[PDB]
Design a protein around this ligand. Structure first.
Ligand SMILES: *[C@@H]1O[C@H](CO)[C@@H](O[C@@H]2O[C@H](CO)[C@@H](O[C@@H]3O[C@H](CO)[C@@H](O)[C@H](O)[C@@H]3O)[C@H](O)[C@H]2NC(C)=O)[C@H](O)[C@H]1NC(C)=O
Ligand SMILES: *[C@@H]1O[C@H](CO)[C@@H](O[C@@H]2O[C@H](CO)[C@@H](O)[C@H](O)[C@H]2NC(C)=O)[C@H](O)[C@H]1NC(C)=O
Ligand SMILES: *[C@@H]1O[C@H](CO)[C@@H](O[C@@H]2O[C@H](CO)[C@@H](O)[C@H](O)[C@H]2NC(C)=O)[C@H](O)[C@H]1NC(C)=O
Ligand SMILES: *[C@@H]1O[C@H](CO)[C@@H](O[C@@H]2O[C@H](CO)[C@@H](O)[C@H](O)[C@H]2NC(C)=O)[C@H](O)[C@H]1NC(C)=O
Ligand SMILES: *[C@@H]1O[C@H](CO)[C@@H](O[C@@H]2O[C@H](CO)[C@@H](O)[C@H](O)[C@H]2NC(C)=O)[C@H](O)[C@H]1NC(C)=O
Ligand SMILES: *[C@@H]1O[C@H](CO)[C@@H](O[C@@H]2O[C@H](CO)[C@@H](O)[C@H](O)[C@H]2NC(C)=O)[C@H](O)[C@H]1NC(C)=O
Ligand SMILES: *[C@@H]1O[C@H](CO)[C@@H](O[C@@H]2O[C@H](CO)[C@@H](O)[C@H](O)[C@H]2NC(C)=O)[C@H](O)[C@H]1NC(C)=O
Ligand code: NAG
Ligand code: NAG
Ligand code: NAG
Ligand code: NAG
Ligand code: NAG
Ligand code: NAG
Lengths: 216, 271, 419, 49, 50
């Protein structure tokens, strides 16, 4: 199944306040009117390549889509990232864990070989995320406020803000979602040029692509 | 091109006395603009005042004459023109003009009162009073139509004049984009200055565009080369800006001379 | 200064631009993020118990701030040394990860913890690689370890005493094959018993009294740093030309209270050309505004060398509440184009001689002084317009006037190779 | 100044933005020439025979 | 190394000469405009009546 992304996926590129200024940015973004691989995983968890950050969207109002596994070997040979939810504590582990056929988790562990780092932190709701990994820094964005411009499809305009940032310094090229034992989109980002219009209070209110149409 | 750094000045002092040339050119063009305004507007050696009671043979000049109600004593069209068109960080200063706006308004009001009351006699000596109708008769004799025409069609001409001035007032009030040239001049000046100040943060092939860090992270043997590259790049950009300003100043001089000729000929006389 | 800039011994009446002035900076303010959670270092250097030398405890410390000054400036430790870097700078150093190795050894063996050293501890117990070591600290344990009665509680991995010949007085070998068994190795019928003990008797002598030794190693360039030292904090000053780094980004200017409102995740605002305009301070969590320090060129109004020898000084585009003879004593006049000193202000108005700006000019013309006045646009008269009155001249004059126009300039030719 | 290359193109964008005003000046000159011709010759409203 | 030194001297002197030539051209253009105005005045006011 495929779907067309109308105008989704615009985020605050940096931490610089601005007001009433048209600013041109040259970074990785989700292009306007792109193809998103809609999945209907109810009764599959395929492993998908990472390829320099991914856009993710979901609309399930319960505790099913919890974790994410990141890596490039998915073996004890090289460290891998586990980012699971617990409804009370977000635990992130970059230590080495061996292969897993299909994980079952939700409220899989092989070993703690060469374990070197661990971190701990804190129309339905449209969960939106953007995951990036660049120059050894791992960034996760978010937007948990839903906008019902249209139904059954993600239409509307909103901006994304950072939540966490980790100096993991690891090489990841592949990932996999998580479920328990018993409708999330996907998108890939490209190095595009955008033109952003900031509001008076410093909020993004309009974006324009630069590789889409002569008017653009 | 130094940003408050001692060794930058030490390197810069060996390039010569170009800064004198730059400052000389800029002061020259500024003085020339002052002279331009002075020669365009300073054409009368008095300031006449219209009589308090007005009866100009039926003509109606209320929308053109200055209004004492406004503190600036500017007429209606002046207010429309000023409200229609709309427009010191690291050594880029702007100096104020010698002639403030109120003096320009007073000059225009004096010129207009003189050309209403006296005609063209105040452009050759002392002002000589003359009734308005007997001035329009002379101006009609000037173009070949005998004066007999005017005196028998005075009311129709007065109505034509009033209706035309009302229509032009409405056209200026409603329709915009009729004042392109001044807006273009302002935009060109602002854009040139803005791109000049934007040029400041370019790498120019050096290691970084921040001078304090590049000094604090290195030693003289190659910091000398890096700073020299930055200095020469910035100096080239500044020279280009100065040359462009000179060209624009020459063009504006030509335009101002043409305007002065038109003001001297078509106002104080009849073409 | 005018004679210098013009490079002449005489000057004519007019206004000249000699130099420029710039308000000098003042004391500096340095800031950083508010507070970092202190790691529990007292559980390492001041724990109630330690580990044996053959099983020295290794632990990892990361993701916090480490204050080495408190443990360095306190003379509560017997031996303190560091390799590669002076200890006093550890409070201004950042590292990726920290590894702490703690054990207890005899007094004499404390000298053997260094790269390139040899011995029973170096070869079997604590194998330090031949590389830079963070910091080695050691302190006497006779007060808490030996005196309480622990004179035999520590074992050391010496060797198996199995496969060596009498090569010297001490039969020491590096062939330690056994030892995996938690019972010090079983040689069939206890033929060989490795892992001898320490005789930590308090009254035996200080030569081999128990000593707690902790070694700190730092991880470099494997990943971006996570642990740093305590940074120097100072207060702030307002309404002064101040230079700062202000939590990371340098800048010289004057601070003021701001009205902008930030989203909870910004750090500093700007307008154009990478010029910061508003910043926020993490300790106070408050937003302040930055304004560049004032500057500008100076000018001198002079009536000419011939007439007099006194001048007036005009500062351009500066509110001259604080400019610092012609610095504070002479009379001051604030115009729309800066402020001038040395000349008086009169309310009268005359013709204009030396233009200044904003519609005023200064000269002595209508006693041996410079006065600045508001120029007069001309004379004043009113003509008695009336609808049945005219004026006709009766006499005439003939006047001759002069006009001058340039038509040419000198022709100059310059060679290229010669020059 | 590059001639269908990549290294030269990368090195060129590091020097600033001279080319913007270069192209702007040339385009302004061309527009001025067209305006000159049109204003010189277009002086009548109708066409007479 | 003499070649490097002469390179530096040559480039500096070239820049100075270019600036001088540009300034001369601007001044010549302005003077030519003034000369045309003077020629108009002489031809119109001396050989006839204004
Ligand atoms: C990122 O991907 C690269 C693959 O291009 C991984 O780099 C490689 O990591 C291995 C780790 O064993 C390096 O081998 C080691 O190199 C050191 C020298 O620094 C040597 O002393 C060791 O004996 C061993 O041979 C290998 O050199 C390195 N290659 C490159 C090109 O960097 C890397 O592991 C990935 N990132 C992470 C966080 O795993
Ligand atoms: C910007 O934020 C303010 C408050 O965070 C929003 O609310 C305005 O607040 C100001 C100050 O009290 C009031 O004068 C306005 O009337 C408020 N506006 C509304 C619509 O209530 C404001 O809306 C935000 N956006 C803008 C453009 O100011
Ligand atoms: C000249 O024209 C002005 C146009 O504004 C006239 O002012 C208006 O006059 C009418 C009738 O006399 C009034 O109803 C309006 O209120 C006036 N305008 C304003 C803004 O008050 C003025 O009367 C004309 N003068 C003569 C002598 O006809
Ligand atoms: C952050 O720094 C401040 C100043 O040193 C500490 O003091 C608090 O400052 C905030 C304002 O930012 C006030 O609202 C509190 O009342 C202050 N606390 C006290 C006890 O005076 C503050 O404690 C620091 N924050 C942390 C987490 O250490
Ligand atoms: C130069 O700065 C001073 C401030 O030191 C200005 O003084 C103002 O004086 C009035 C009269 O009491 C106050 O209401 C203002 O608040 C003062 N300004 C400030 C910023 O506090 C003075 O006006 C300034 N000069 C000019 C020409 O603006
Ligand atoms: C023609 O008549 C007018 C009006 O009576 C004269 O103007 C006045 O002249 C006197 C002479 O000193 C002045 O005091 C008045 O101020 C003038 N009136 C106004 C309104 O300015 C005028 O002078 C007469 N012509 C001649 C040649 O004397
Ligand atoms: C017009 O003005 C001229 C002077 O500008 C008058 O000529 C003067 O007349 C007086 C009296 O006769 C002599 O004393 C002067 O010497 C004359 N001046 C010159 C330059 O010769 C002339 O009289 C005036 N016109 C009339 C009609 O009075
Ligand atoms: C499904 C949708 O909305 N848009 C397109 C669809 O038109 C197209 O057929 C498909 C690949 O062929 O890619 C997607
Ligand atoms: C047994 C084992 O995995 N040891 C590795 C070691 O080889 C590597 O050098 C170090 C990080 O560089 O991490 C650990
Ligand atoms: C996960 O959540 C459960 C219940 O919400 C809680 O008991 C448990 O401590 C949490 N896990 C962690 C690591 O805090
Ligand atoms: C623990 O810290 C105190 C504080 O100075 C010090 O006096 C004491 O010696 C420390 N304990 C040990 C075993 O060094
Ligand atoms: C000063 O002016 C007087 C009068 O014009 C003149 O005689 C004298 O030579 C002048 N002196 C100087 C030094 O200019
Ligand atoms: C302007 O006139 C007022 C009115 O008397 C006077 O007080 C003031 O001193 C005058 N201005 C100057 C600069 O003298």
């Amino acid at each position: 199944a495929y779907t067309n992304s109308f105008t989704r996926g615009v985020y605050y590129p940096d931490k610089v306040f601005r007001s009433s200024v048209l600013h041109s940015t040259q970074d990785l973004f989700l292009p306007f009117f792109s193809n998103v691989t809609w999945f209907h995983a109810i009764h599959d968890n395929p492993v998908l390549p990472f390829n320099d950050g991914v856009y993710f969207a979901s609309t399930e109002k319960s505790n099913i889509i919890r974790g994410w596994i990141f890596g490039t070997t998915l073996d004890s040979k090289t460290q891998s990232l586990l980012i699971v939810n617990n409804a009370t504590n977000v635990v992130i582990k970059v230590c080495e864990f061996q292969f897993c056929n299909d994980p079952f988790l939700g409220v899989v562990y092989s070993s703690a070989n060469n374990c070197t780092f661990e971190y701990v932190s804190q129309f339905k709701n449209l969960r939106e995320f953007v995951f990036k990994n660049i120059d050894g820094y791992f960034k996760i964005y978010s937007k948990h406020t839903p906008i019902n411009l249209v139904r059954d499809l993600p239409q509307g305009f909103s901006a994304l803000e950072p939540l966490v940032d980790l100096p993991i310094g690891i090489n990841i090229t592949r990932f996999q979602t998580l479920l328990a034992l018993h409708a999330y989109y996907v998108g890939y980002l490209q190095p595009r040029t955008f033109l952003l219009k900031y509001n008076e209070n410093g909020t993004i209110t309009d974006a324009v692509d630069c590789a889409l149409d002569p008017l653009s | 091109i130094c940003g408050d750094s001692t060794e930058c000045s030490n390197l810069l002092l060996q390039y010569g006395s170009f800064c004198t040339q730059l400052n000389r050119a800029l002061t020259g063009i500024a003085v020339e603009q002052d002279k331009n305004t002075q020669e365009v507007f300073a054409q009368v050696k008095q300031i006449y005042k219209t009589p308090p009671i007005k009866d100009f043979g039926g003509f109606n000049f209320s929308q053109i004459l200055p209004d004492p109600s406004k503190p600036s004593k500017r007429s209606f069209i002046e207010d429309l023109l000023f409200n229609k068109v709309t427009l010191k960080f690291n050594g880029l200063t702007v100096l104020p003009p010698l002639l403030t706006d109120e003096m320009i308004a007073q000059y225009t009001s004096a010129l207009l009162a003189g050309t209403i009351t006296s005609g063209w006699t105040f452009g050759a000596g002392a002002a000589l009073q003359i009734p308005f109708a007997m001035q329009m008769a002379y101006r009609f004799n000037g173009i070949g139509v005998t004066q007999n025409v005017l005196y028998e069609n005075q009311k129709l001409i007065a109505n034509q004049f009033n209706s035309a001035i009302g229509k032009i007032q409405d056209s200026l009030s409603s329709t915009a984009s009729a004042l392109g040239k001044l807006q273009d001049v302002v935009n060109q000046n602002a854009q040139a200055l803005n791109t000049l100040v934007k040029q400041l943060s370019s790498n120019f092939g050096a290691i970084s565009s921040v001078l304090n860090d590049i000094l604090s992270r290195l030693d003289p043997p190659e910091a000398e080369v890096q700073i020299d590259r930055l200095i020469t790049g910035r100096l080239q950009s500044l020279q280009t800006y100065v040359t462009q300003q000179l060209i624009r100043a020459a063009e504006i001089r030509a335009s101002a001379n043409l305007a002065a000729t038109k003001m001297s000929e078509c106002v104080l006389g009849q073409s | 200064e005018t004679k210098c800039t013009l490079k002449s011994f005489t000057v004519e009446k007019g206004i000249y631009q000699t130099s420029n002035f710039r308000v000098q900076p003042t004391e500096s303010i340095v800031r950083f993020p508010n507070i970092t959670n202190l790691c529990p270092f007292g559980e390492v250097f001041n724990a109630t118990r330690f580990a044996s030398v053959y099983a020295w405890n290794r632990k990892r410390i990361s993701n916090c701030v480490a204050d080495y000054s408190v443990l360095y400036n306190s003379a509560s430790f017997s031996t303190f040394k560091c390799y590669g870097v002076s200890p006093t700078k550890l409070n201004d150093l950042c590292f990726t990860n920290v590894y702490a190795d703690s054990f207890v050894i005899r007094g004499d063996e404390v000298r053997q913890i260094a790269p390139g050293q040899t011995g029973k501890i170096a070869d079997y117990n604590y194998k330090l690689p031949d590389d830079f070591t963070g910091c080695v600290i050691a302190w006497n344990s006779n007060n808490l370890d030996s005196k309480v009665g622990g004179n035999y509680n520590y074992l050391y991995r010496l060797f198996r005493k199995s496969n060596l010949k009498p090569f010297e007085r001490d039969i020491s070998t590096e062939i330690y094959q056994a030892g995996s068994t938690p019972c010090n190795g079983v040689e069939g019928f206890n033929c060989y018993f490795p892992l001898q003990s320490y005789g930590f008797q308090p009254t035996n002598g200080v030569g081999y009294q128990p000593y707690r030794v902790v070694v700190l190693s730092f991880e470099l360039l494997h990943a971006p740093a996570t642990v740093c030292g305590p940074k120097k904090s100072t207060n702030l000053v307002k309404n002064k030309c101040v230079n700062f780094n202000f939590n990371g980004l340098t800048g010289t200017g004057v601070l003021t209270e701001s009205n902008k409102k930030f989203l909870p995740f910004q750090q500093f605002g700007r307008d154009i050309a990478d010029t910061t305009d508003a910043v926020r301070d993490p300790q106070t969590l408050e937003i302040l505004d930055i304004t560049p320090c004032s500057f500008g060129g100076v000018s001198v109004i002079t009536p000419g060398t011939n007439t007099s020898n006194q001048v007036a000084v005009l500062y351009q585009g500066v509110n001259c509440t604080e400019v610092p003879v012609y610095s504070t004593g002479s009379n001051v006049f604030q115009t729309r184009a800066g402020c001038l000193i040395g000349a008086e202000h009169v309310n009268n108005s005359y013709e204009c001689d030396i233009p200044i700006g904003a519609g005023i000019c200064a000269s002595y013309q209508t006693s041996q002084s410079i006065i600045a006045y508001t120029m007069s646009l001309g004379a004043e008269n009113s003509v008695a317009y009336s609808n049945n009155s005219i004026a006709i001249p009766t006499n005439f004059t003939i006047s001759v006037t002069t006009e001058i126009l340039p038509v040419s300039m000198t022709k100059t030719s310059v060679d290229c190779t010669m020059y």
